[PDB]
Design an enzyme around this catalytic site. Structure first.
Site, PDB file in Angstrom:
ATOM      1  N   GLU A 152       0.842  -1.188   0.000  1.00 43.37           N
ATOM      2  CA  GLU A 152       0.000   0.000   0.000  1.00 43.37           C
ATOM      3  C   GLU A 152       0.881   1.243   0.000  1.00 43.37           C
ATOM      4  OE1 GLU A 152      -3.184   0.598  -0.465  1.00 43.37           O
ATOM      5  OE2 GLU A 152      -2.606   2.703  -0.322  1.00 43.37           O
ATOM      6  N   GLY A 209      -3.576  -8.068   5.253  1.00 43.39           N
ATOM      7  CA  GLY A 209      -3.136  -8.892   4.139  1.00 43.39           C
ATOM      8  C   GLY A 209      -1.636  -8.850   3.915  1.00 43.39           C
ATOM      9  N   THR A 210      -1.045  -7.653   3.954  1.00 39.25           N
ATOM     10  CA  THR A 210       0.370  -7.520   3.616  1.00 39.25           C
ATOM     11  C   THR A 210       1.262  -8.047   4.733  1.00 39.25           C
ATOM     12  OG1 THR A 210      -0.140  -5.601   2.240  1.00 39.25           O
ATOM     13  CG2 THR A 210       2.152  -5.919   2.874  1.00 39.25           C
ATOM     14  N   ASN A 268      -3.224  -5.676  20.643  1.00 31.56           N
ATOM     15  CA  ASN A 268      -3.529  -4.266  20.423  1.00 31.56           C
ATOM     16  C   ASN A 268      -4.196  -3.630  21.635  1.00 31.56           C
ATOM     17  OD1 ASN A 268      -2.946  -2.335  18.510  1.00 31.56           O
ATOM     18  ND2 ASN A 268      -4.979  -2.409  17.559  1.00 31.56           N
ATOM     19  N   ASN A 294       2.439   2.627  19.678  1.00 30.70           N
ATOM     20  CA  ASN A 294       3.693   2.259  19.037  1.00 30.70           C
ATOM     21  C   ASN A 294       4.906   2.843  19.750  1.00 30.70           C
ATOM     22  OD1 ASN A 294       2.103   0.947  17.196  1.00 30.70           O
ATOM     23  ND2 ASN A 294       2.401   2.434  15.543  1.00 30.70           N
ATOM     24  N   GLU A 303      21.869 -15.790  22.496  1.00 28.51           N
ATOM     25  CA  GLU A 303      21.556 -16.103  23.885  1.00 28.51           C
ATOM     26  C   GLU A 303      20.053 -16.147  24.112  1.00 28.51           C
ATOM     27  OE1 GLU A 303      24.273 -15.959  26.744  1.00 28.51           O
ATOM     28  OE2 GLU A 303      22.662 -17.315  27.370  1.00 28.51           O
TER      29      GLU A 303
END
Ligand SMILES: Nc1nc2c(ncn2[C@@H]2O[C@H](COP(=O)(O)OP(=O)(O)OP(=O)(O)O)[C@@H](O)[C@H]2O)c(=O)[nH]1
Ligand SMILES: Nc1nc2c(ncn2[C@@H]2O[C@H](COP(=O)(O)OP(=O)(O)O)[C@@H](O)[C@H]2O)c(=O)[nH]1
Ligand SMILES: [Mg+2]
Lengths: 37, 166, 73, 432, 431, 50
Positions: free
Chosen positions: D62, D135-136, D197, D219, D245
C-alpha cells in the site's frame, strides 16, 4: 499419530544445522517404518 | 658395529608386525579397553532410555492420546471468556488478590496432565541411591544456612541485623 | 496391640532376610573382581616394564643409523 | 561485529517502524538528518561518513503509508532504495499477499536484503515486524519469511507480530489471516513474540492515565520493548544477552517459540515523583497481568522459560532478590521440569525518553519476555473464531479466487490444533 | 625457577582474572604501566612465577585471555591494570557461545582451540620449569566452560606431569542467571574429574553471603565478589612468591590434600574478612584467625562443612607469627571436633607459614579444604539436570553441533561416581 | 554391609589405578609412535645408499 515435540524440528531450526536436518529425516523414516510394521 | 646395528634394526622393525611383540600386546590391551568402555557407554545410554525416557514418554503420550483436542479448546474458551468477563466488569485485575467466587485462575493449573514418575528407578543414580534404597528396605533438604534471598534487596538490607545502622 | 508388634517384628525379620541375601551375593561379586583386576594390574606392570625396555632400544637405533649413514656416505 | 537487519512488513510494521527508528535515533544521538553531532572534519561531512543509514527495509504493497515516511520528519535518515512500495495493497487477503500480488514484490525485497547483507560484516539475525490481521503483514510476511529461510541459514529470524484482539477488531477477516500466517510462524520463525492491540490500550488507560490513546501512543511504548531486548548488543552491561543467547535459553522445543512480552515501569510524569521505582518493586509489576502486553493470564499457564532485560542502575544483588520473590509466590506458577527458568540481563544504559512522550524518565526498567503455556489460551480464542467462520465457509471466494486452494485452510487449522495439543503436552507436570 | 601459567576463560574468568592481577601486581609492586616500584627486595626476587621479562624493565603477566565475544575484553582492556597484558595473548572469537556448552566445545570452540593452544605452548616453552596450570572460569557458562574444559583436556594430554589448578565458579541453586545453567555444569565436571588434577570450587551465593554477613556490604556488586576470589588465588601461591618458615608449594599442597585421585575437589575461604566498622574493635591474633577460619559463614563454598566430614584440610598462614601457636591451634580444633574430622587420617590438617603478609593486613590465612561435604553442591546441580534431561528440555540446542543426547548419560554418570565415592569414604571407618 | 563396603572400596580403588596405568600406557604409545616415521625413513634412506 503425531510426532513427539522433542523430536519435531521446525524448518527454521532445521535449515540451521545439516546434522540436525539429517536427525529429523532419520526420525521421519522411523515413523514410516513403525507404521508399516 | 654391523652386528649390533643389524640386531637393533631387526628388533625395532619386527616389533611393528610381530604378534608376540610388546607393541602388539599394548595395542591389544588398548583395543580391549576401548571396546569395553564403548560397550559400557552404549549399554548405559540404552538402559537409561528404556528404564526412564521410554516409560515416561509412554505414560505422557498415552495420557495425551486419551485426551481429546475439542475438550481442550472448549475448556480454554471457557477460561478465556472468564478472564475477559472479569476484565470487562472489574476496574482492572491484580494478581495478588484472588476472589474465589469471582475468578479462580488456579483451576487452569489444577486441570493439568499428571504423570506418576514413582515407579521409575533411574539407572544413572544407582550408586548414589543405593544407600537410600538399603535404608528404606530428589534428595533431602541440602545446603548451608544462609541469609534469606528475599532479604537481599535494598529494602530489607537495613531491616536485617546485618547492616542495621551502617 | 500385641498382634501389631508381632507383625512388625516379622516384617522387620522378613525384610532383613531378603536384603542380607543380596549383601552376601554382592560382597562375593566384589571380592572376585577385585582379585581379578589386581592380577590384571600386575600384568600391565610387567607389560609397562617390557615396553620401556623396548622403547629404550629406539633412541640408540636412531643414533646408530645416523652413524652408519655418514660412514656409508 | 554484532549487527541486525530488521524488516518491517505491512502498515502496522511500518508505523511501528516509524516509532522504533525514532527511538533508535534518540538513543544513539542520531539526528533525523542522520548526522551525529581540522580539515578532516570538513572532509568528514561531505564524504557521508557521519551518516548512519538504518539496516532496515520498509516494504508494503500500500503506497499511502510508506510515502508518509518518505515525506515525514525522517526523509533524510532512510535510503530511498530501502523503502519499497506497491501498486495495490493485499487488502486483508492472505492469498493476495502470498500468491498473486506479493509474488512480484518479494523478489525485489530479497534484492534489497542481499545489498544489506553485503554491507554487514557478520550478520547475527533477522527481525520481522508485521501484523497477521492484515493482508500484507500476513501474506507478504509469510512469503518473505519463507524465502529468507532458503537464502540464509544459521541466521535467526525473530518475529514481532501484532495478533488480533479477542474483543477488538478493525476488520472482519482477522481469523482467516491470523490462522494462515500462524502456520508460517510455526514453521519459519525462530522466536516469535506476541503483541496484542488492546492490551496496550489497557496499559495506557491504567498506567499512563490517558483516556484517549491512538496508534502513535501505542507504538511508542512498543518501541520501548524492541530496543530493551536488543540493548545488550548496543551497550555494555554486567550481564549481556545476545540474540543467540535469546534462543538457547528461552525456547525448550522447536515448536514452542511463541512468547509473551511485558514492560515493568510504565509511569506518567506526574505519577513518577510519588512512586518509588525499585528493582524489587517493578519486578513484581512486571509479572502483573495488567502490565503485560498480551491480554492473557500468566496464572492460567506455567512459565516454561523467561528472560529479564534490566536497564539503568541495577546491581546484580537486588535483581537476584527479585528472582526469589517471584519464585516463592504461589500466584506465579512455574513448570516442574525447569527449576532455573530466569535469564538475567543487565544493561548500564538508562532508557531514553522520546520528546513529547507519555513515558517519564525512569532510572531502572525491566522488559520481561516469557514463554508460557497460556499462549495457547490466545490460540484457542482464534481457533474457534476461525472454526465458526469456516464452518459456513464465508470469505472463502476471495482466497480461492486469488490462487489459494481450499485445502490450505484445513492445513493451517491442522497445524494450529497441533500447537494447541502441544502446549497441554509440554504443560504437563511430573509429580510423584 | 617455578612458574604458573594463568588462563582466563569467558566473561567470569576475564572479570575474576582482572581483579586477581589487580592484587598480585600491586602486591609485587607493578604499576599500571608495568614497571617495578616496590621498596622491598623480597618482591623483586620471585616475580617469574607470574610475570615474564621484557625490555625496559617491564613485566608482562603470563596470562592468556580467551573468550568468544569481543564485549568483555573491551572491559578488561579499558579497566585499570589492563595495559600490562600482552596483545598477542588477546585471542578471541566473534560468534559467541551464548551460554551453550557444546557450541563453545564442538562447533565453534574447535576453530579457536588451535589458536589458544599455540599461545599456551609458546608461553610454556619459553619458561624453564613449570609448576602448574592455573585457570579461572565458570562451570555454568558456555564461553568459559565449553572452551575452557576442552583446553583442560588438551593441555593435560601434552603436559601430563604438571599440576593443574581450576578456580571454577559453580552454578548456584538460590540465584540463577541462565536457564540452561545445569546442563553446562554437569558436562564440565565430567570433563574435570579426569583431566584437572585438583579443583578450587567457588559459588556466587557463598560469595554473596560472606560479602554481607562478614564485610557488611549492603550493596555487593561483582567487584567485591571477585576481590574475595582474588585474595584466595594469591593465598595459594604464597609459598612460591615469598620465603617462609614452612614451605608448601603447589605440588606439596596437592599431595597432602588429595588421598585419592577423584577426591580432588576443594572448598576455600579467606580468613581475615572484617567490616571497617568492626575493624578497630577486633584484635588480630592467631587464635582469632583460627576461630573465623573454621566457621561455616566464612566459607566461599555453598556446601555445608557442618553436615560432612573433613578428609583433609590445609591452612596457608601469611605473616610474622609463632609456629608453636599454629600447631597448638590446629590440634585444638581437631580434638574439640572429633566427629567433624576424618578418623582414618591422623594429622588431618597440614599447614605452612610464610613471613610476608599481604598489603593492608598484618596477619592473614588462606584455607584449603578437602571435605567429603562437597557432594551436596554436585547433588543440587544433579537435581536440576534430571529435572530437565528426563523431559528433553532445551536439548535440541545441544545436539545440533554433533554431540547427541547419548553423550549426556556418561556426564551424569561421572557426576554420580564422584558423589558416591565422597559418600562412601564418609561412612567408612577404621579397622 | 560393613563387609560389603570394605570390598566395594577396594574394588573401586584397583579399578581406578587400572585406568591410570592404562592412560600411562597410551601416553608412552603416542610418544614413541612419532619416532616410527623417522626410524622408517632413515632405514629406507640407509638401504638406498647401499
Ligand atoms: N500496534 C499497532 N497495530 C497496528 C497499527 N496499525 C495497524 N495495526 C494492526 O493492524 C491491523 C490492520 O491490518 P494491517 O496489518 O495494518 O493491514 P496492512 O498492513 O495495511 O496490509 P493490507 O491490509 O494488505 O493493506 C489492525 O487490526 C491493528 O491491530 C499500529 O499503528 N500499531
Ligand atoms: N564472581 C563472579 N561471577 C560472575 C561474574 N560474571 C558472571 N558471573 C557468573 O557467571 C554466571 C554466568 O556465566 P557467563 O557470564 O554467561 O559465562 P560466559 O558464557 O563465559 O560468558 C552467572 O551465574 C554469574 O554468577 C563476575 O564478574 N564475578
Ligand atoms: Mg495497507
Amino acid at each position: 499419530s503425531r510426532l513427539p515435540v522433542h523430536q519435531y524440528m521446525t524448518t527454521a531450526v532445521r535449515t540451521r544445522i545439516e546434522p540436525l536436518n539429517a536427525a529429523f529425516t532419520a526420525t521421519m523414516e522411523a515413523r514410516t517404518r513403525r507404521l508399516a510394521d | 658395529r654391523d652386528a649390533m646395528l643389524g640386531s637393533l634394526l631387526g628388533d625395532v622393525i619386527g616389533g611393528l608386525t610381530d604378534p608376540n611383540s610388546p607393541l602388539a600386546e599394548a595395542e591389544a590391551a588398548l583395543s580391549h579397553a576401548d571396546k569395553v568402555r564403548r560397550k559400557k557407554k552404549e549399554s548405559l545410554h540404552n538402559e537409561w532410555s528404556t528404564q526412564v525416557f521410554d516409560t515416561i514418554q509412554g505414560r505422557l503420550q498415552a495420557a495425551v492420546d486419551a485426551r481429546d483436542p475439542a475438550a481442550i479448546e472448549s475448556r480454554l474458551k471457557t477460561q478465556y471468556d472468564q478472564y475477559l468477563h472479569t476484565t470487562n466488569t472489574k476496574v482492572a485485575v491484580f494478581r495478588d488478590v484472588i476472589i474465589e467466587q469471582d475468578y479462580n485462575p488456579l483451576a487452569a493449573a489444577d486441570a493439568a496432565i499428571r504423570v506418576p514418575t514413582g515407579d521409575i528407578r533411574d539407572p544413572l543414580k544407582r550408586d548414589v541411591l543405593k544407600g537410600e534404597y538399603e535404608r528404606r528396605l530428589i534428595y533431602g533438604p541440602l545446603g548451608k544456612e544462609t541469609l534469606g534471598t528475599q532479604q537481599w534487596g535494598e529494602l530489607a538490607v537495613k531491616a536485617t541485623p546485618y547492616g542495621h545502622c551502617t | 496391640g500385641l498382634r501389631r508388634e508381632l507383625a512388625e517384628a516379622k516384617s522387620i525379620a522378613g525384610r532383613a532376610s531378603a536384603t542380607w541375601d543380596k549383601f552376601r551375593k554382592e560382597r562375593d561379586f566384589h571380592r572376585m573382581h577385585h582379585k581379578r583386576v589386581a592380577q590384571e594390574k600386575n600384568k600391565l606392570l610387567t607389560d609397562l616394564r617390557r615396553l620401556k625396555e623396548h622403547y629404550a632400544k629406539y633412541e640408540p637405533t636412531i643414533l646408530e643409523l645416523k652413524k652408519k649413514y655418514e660412514t656409508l656416505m | 561485529m554484532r549487527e541486525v537487519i530488521s524488516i518491517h512488513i505491512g502498515q502496522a510494521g511500518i508505523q511501528v517502524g516509524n516509532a522504533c527508528w525514532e527511538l533508535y535515533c534518540l538513543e544513539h544521538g542520531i539526528q533525523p538528518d542522520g548526522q551525529m553531532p581540522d580539515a578532516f572534519n570538513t572532509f568528514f561531512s561531505e564524504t557521508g561518513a557521519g551518516k548512519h543509514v538504518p539496516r532496515c527495509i520498509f516494504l508494503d504493497l500500500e503506497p499511502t503509508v510508506v510515502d508518509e515516511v518518505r515525506t515525514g520528519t525522517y526523509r533524510q535518515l532512510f535510503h530511498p532504495e530501502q523503502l519499497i512500495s506497491g501498486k495495490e495493497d493485499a487488502a486483508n487477503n492472505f492469498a493476495r499477499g502470498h500468491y498473486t500480488i506479493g509474488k512480484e514484490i518479494v523478489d525485489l525485497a530479497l534484492d534489497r536484503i542481499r545489498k544489506l547483507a553485503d554491507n554487514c560484516t557478520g550478520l547475527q539475525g533477522f527481525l520481522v515486524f508485521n501484523a497477521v490481521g492484515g493482508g500484507t503483514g500476513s501474506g507478504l510476511g509469510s512469503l518473505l519469511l519463507e524465502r529468507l529461510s532458503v537464502d540464509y541459514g544459521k541466521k535467526s529470524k525473530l518475529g514481532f507480530t501484532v495478533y488480533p484482539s479477542p474483543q477488538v477488531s478493525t476488520a472482519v477477516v482477522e481469523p482467516y489471516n491470523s490462522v494462515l500466517s500462524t502456520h508460517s510462524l510455526l514453521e519459519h520463525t525462530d522466536v516469535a513474540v506476541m503483541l496484542d492491540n488492546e492490551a496496550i490500550y489497557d496499559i495506557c488507560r491504567r498506567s499512563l492515565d490517558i483516556e484517549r490513546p491512538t496508534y502513535t501512543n501505542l507504538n511508542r511504548l512498543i518501541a520501548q520493548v524492541i530496543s530493551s531486548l536488543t540493548a545488550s548488543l548496543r551497550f555494555d552491561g554486567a550481564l549481556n544477552v545476545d540474540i543467540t543467547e535469546f534462543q538457547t535459553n528461552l525456547v525448550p522445543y522447536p515448536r514452542i517459540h511463541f512468547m509473551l512480552s511485558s514492560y515493568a515501569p510504565i509511569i506518567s510524569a506526574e505519577k513518577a515523583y510519588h512512586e518509588q521505582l525499585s528493582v524489587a518493586e517493578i519486578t513484581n509489576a512486571a509479572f502483573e497481568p495488567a502490565s503485560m502486553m498480551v491480554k492473557c493470564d500468566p496464572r492460567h499457564g506455567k512459565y516454561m522459560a523467561c528472560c529479564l532485560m534490566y536497564r539503568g542502575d541495577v546491581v546484580p544483588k537486588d535483581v537476584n532478590a527479585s528472582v526469589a520473590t517471584i519464585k516463592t509466590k504461589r500466584t506465579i506458577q512455574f513448570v516442574d521440569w525447569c527449576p532455573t527458568g530466569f535469564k538475567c540481563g543487565i544493561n548500564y544504559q538508562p532508557p531514553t525518553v522520546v520528546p513529547g512522550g507519555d513515558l517519564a524518565k525512569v532510572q531502572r526498567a525491566v522488559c520481561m519476555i516469557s514463554n508460557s503455556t497460556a499462549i495457547g489460551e490466545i490460540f484457542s480464542r482464534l481457533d474457534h473464531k476461525f472454526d465458526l467462520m469456516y464452518a459456513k465457509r464465508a470469505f472463502v471466494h476471495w482466497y480461492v479466487g486469488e490462487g489459494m486452494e481450499e485445502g490450505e485452510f484445513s492445513e493451517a487449522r491442522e497445524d494450529l490444533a497441533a500447537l494447541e495439543k502441544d502446549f497441554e503436552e509440554v504443560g504437563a507436570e511430573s509429580a510423584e | 625457577m617455578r612458574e604458573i601459567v594463568h588462563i582466563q576463560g569467558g566473561q567470569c574468568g576475564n572479570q575474576i582474572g582482572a581483579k586477581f592481577w589487580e592484587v598480585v601486581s600491586d602486591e609485587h609492586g607493578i604499576d599500571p604501566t608495568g614497571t617495578y616500584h616496590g621498596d622491598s627486595d623480597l618482591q623483586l626476587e620471585r616475580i617469574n612465577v607470574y610475570f615474564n621479562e621484557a625490555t625496559g624493565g617491564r613485566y608482562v603477566p603470563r596470562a592468556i585471555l580467551m573468550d568468544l565475544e569481543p564485549g568483555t575484553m573491551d572491559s578488561v582492556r579499558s579497566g585499570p591494570y589492563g595495559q600490562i597484558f600482552r596483545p598477542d595473548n588477546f585471542v578471541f572469537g566473534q560468534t559467541g557461545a551464548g551460554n551453550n556448552w557444546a557450541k563453545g566445545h564442538y562447533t565453534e570452540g574447535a576453530e579457536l582451540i588451535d589458536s589458544v593452544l599455540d599461545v599456551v605452548r609458546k608461553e610454556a616453552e619459553s619458561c624453564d620449569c613449570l609448576q602448574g596450570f592455573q585457570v579461572c572460569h565458570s562451570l555454568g557458562g558456555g564461553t568459559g566452560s565449553g572452551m575452557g574444559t576442552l583446553l583442560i583436556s588438551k593441555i593435560r594430554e601434552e603436559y601430563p606431569d604438571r599440576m593443574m589448578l581450576t578456580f571454577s565458579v559453580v552454578p548456584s541453586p538460590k540465584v540463577s542467571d541462565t536457564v540452561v545453567e545445569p546442563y553446562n555444569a554437569t558436562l564440565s565436571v565430567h570433563q574435570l574429574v579426569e583431566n584437572a588434577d585438583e579443583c578450587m570450587v567457588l559459588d556466587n551465593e557463598a560469595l554473596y553471603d560472606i560479602c554481607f554477613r562478614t564485610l557488611k556490604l549492603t550493596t555487593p556488586t561483582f567487584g567485591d565478589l571477585n576481590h574475595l576470589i582474588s585474595a584466595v588465588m594469591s593465598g595459594i601461591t604464597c609459598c612460591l612468591r615469598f620465603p617462609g618458615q614452612l614451605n608448601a608449594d603447589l605440588r606439596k599442597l596437592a599431595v597432602n590434600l588429595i588421598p585419592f585421585p577423584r577426591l580432588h575437589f576443594f572448598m576455600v575461604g579467606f580468613t581475615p574478612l572484617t567490616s571497617r566498622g568492626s575493624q578497630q574493635y577486633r584484635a588480630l591474633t592467631v587464635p582469632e584467625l583460627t576461630q573465623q577460619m573454621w566457621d561455616a559463614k566464612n566459607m566461599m563454598c555453598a556446601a555445608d562443612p557442618r553436615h560432612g566430614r573433613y578428609l583433609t584440610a590445609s591452612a596457608l598462614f601469611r605473616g610474622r607469627m609463632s609456629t608453636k601457636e599454629v600447631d597448638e591451634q590446629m590440634l585444638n580444633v581437631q580434638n574439640k571436633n572429633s566427629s567433624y574430622f576424618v578418623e582414618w587420617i591422623p594429622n588431618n590438617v597440614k599447614s605452612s607459614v610464610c613471613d610476608i603478609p599481604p598489603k593492608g593486613l598484618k596477619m592473614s590465612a588462606t584455607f584449603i579444604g578437602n571435605s567429603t561435604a562437597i557432594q551436596e553442591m554436585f547433588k543440587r546441580v544433579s537435581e536440576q539436570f534430571t529435572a530437565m534431561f528426563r523431559r528433553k528440555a532445551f536439548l535440541h540446542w545441544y545436539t545440533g553441533e554433533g554431540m547427541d543426547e547419548m553423550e549426556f548419560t556418561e556426564a551424569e554418570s561421572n557426576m554420580n561416581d564422584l558423589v558416591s565415592e565422597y559418600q562412601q569414604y564418609q561412612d567408612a571407618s577404621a579397622e
